């Protein structure tokens, strides 16, 4: 059963919503007590999107160790990912502290700071070389070193400095800039090219800390990136690529963070991306 053929059946039946709701009903439920403490209220973008206690990232500071972020450990694929919400104005220092402490090399961003006229994400990196950002609370300095703007995505080289030790580290920021305001990309071509760029950079390698991935809530678009990448890894690993079941992979990742893949559309897109990814390895004025 090629994923290909299952896709065609689901599409012919119009049953993407029914499959997605099955996945919702079978998904793990673990407690999130820490996330729900009163003092962490202002560290969560949404009241219904919380990291599970067992897989949450702890900040290595003393006063409050809480950040809305989850370590997704995919054991057979041998890759790990941190999935996190878009930083809030008050949690930007905590975001970079996490990056520092976890020894991440890359950050993947899948939203714009501003979408449908709402702030989805704080401007948590410097837009200009000459205006560095100082996070006073976590004692970090962040500088824009360079940026390569392409048509579907931007890669920035950032320097993060620990002002306590003066150690510096180069962070790669991979920003997918063209996810539509509504729905999903009609084609996964640019998303896949993006993903292979992140892989090519070495940021997903085992010599680094887990890559940091976010969108606004850290579960929808972020879920598509990790699901797609893990499925692709699993196909290559196993003698058989037609034995990878994206449904069961998704359920496995949902043991580490709630809600990954948030719409039936996003589920369909992730199927598409894995199918086109595996393979790889009209005149109109509607406006
Ligand atoms: C058991 C899960 C696991 C095993 C390994 C080697 N990693 C890993 C962690 C981070 C990165 N960048 C790559 C891989 N994660």
Q: In total, how many beta strands? A: 11
Strand content: 15-25%
- DSSP summary: helix tally: 8
| Strand order in the sheet with the most strands | 1-2-3-11-4-10-9-8-7
User: Which class do the helix and strand fractions yield?
Assistant: alpha/beta
Shape: globular
**Which kinds of small molecule does this entry bind, naming each only once?**
4-(3-ethyl-5-methyl-1H-pyrazol-1-yl)aniline
Strand and helix order: HHHEEEHEEEEEEEHEHHH
Q: Can you tell me the number of structural domains?
A: 1
Radius of gyration: 19 Å
Distance between the termini: 40 Å
User: Which bin fits the share of residues in helices?
Assistant: 25-40%
Q: Main β-sheet, in a few words? A: 9 strands, mixed
PDB class: hydrolase
Keywords: Complex, hydrolase
Assembly: monomeric
Entry title: Wildtype PTP1b in complex with DES5742
Structure, explained:
Helix 2 (16-26) packs across helix 8. With 287 residues, the protein is an alpha/beta fold. The longest helix has 17 residues, at 221-237. 32% of the residues lie in helices and 22% in strands. The chain has helices at residues 3-13, 16-26, 33-36, 92-102, 189-200, 221-237, 246-253, 264-280; strands at 56-58, 66-74, 79-84, 106-109, 114-115, 118-119, 133-135, 140-149, 153-162, 168-176, 211-214. It is built from eight helices and eleven strands. A nine-stranded mixed beta sheet has the order 1-2-3-11-4-10-9-8-7, sandwiched between helices. A hairpin with a 2-residue loop joins strand 5 (114-115) and strand 6 (118-119). It has one domain. The termini are far apart. The protein is globular. Bound molecules: 4-(3-ethyl-5-methyl-1H-pyrazol-1-yl)aniline (YXF). The site of 4-(3-ethyl-5-methyl-1H-pyrazol-1-yl)aniline has 11 residues, from strand 3.
């Amino acid at each position: 059963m090629e994923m290909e053929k299952e896709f065609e059946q689901i599409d012919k039946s119009g049953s993407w919503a029914a499959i997605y709701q099955d996945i919702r009903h079978e998904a793990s439920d673990f407690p999130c007590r820490v996330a729900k403490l009163p003092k962490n209220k202002n560290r969560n973008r949404y009241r219904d999107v919380s990291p599970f206690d067992h897989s949450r990232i702890k900040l290595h500071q003393e006063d409050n160790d809480y950040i809305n972020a989850s370590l997704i450990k995919m054991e057979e694929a041998q890759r790990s990912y941190i999935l996190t919400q878009g930083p809030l104005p008050n949690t930007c220092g905590h975001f970079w502290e996490m990056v520092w402490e976890q020894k991440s090399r890359g950050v993947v961003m899948l939203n714009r700071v501003m979408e449908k006229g709402s702030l989805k994400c704080a401007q948590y990196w410097p837009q200009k070389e000459e205006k560095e950002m100082i996070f006073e609370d976590t004692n970090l300095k962040l500088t824009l070193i360079s940026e390569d703007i392409k048509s579907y995505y931007t890669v920035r080289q950032l320097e993060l400095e620990n002002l306590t030790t003066q150690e510096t580290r180069e962070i790669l920021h991979f920003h997918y800039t063209t996810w539509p305001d509504f729905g999903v990309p009609e084609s996964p071509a640019s998303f896949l090219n993006f993903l292979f760029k992140v892989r090519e950079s070495g940021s997903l390698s085992p010599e680094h800390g887990p890559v940091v991935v976010h969108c606004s809530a850290g579960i929808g678009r972020s879920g598509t990136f990790c699901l797609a990448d893990t499925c692709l890894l699993l196909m290559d690993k196993r003698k058989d690529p037609s034995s990878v079941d994206i449904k069961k992979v998704l359920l496995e990742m949902r043991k580490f963070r709630m809600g990954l893949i948030q719409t039936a559309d996003q589920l369909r897109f992730s199927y598409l991306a894995v199918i086109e990814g595996a393979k790889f390895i009209e005149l109109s004025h509607e406006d």
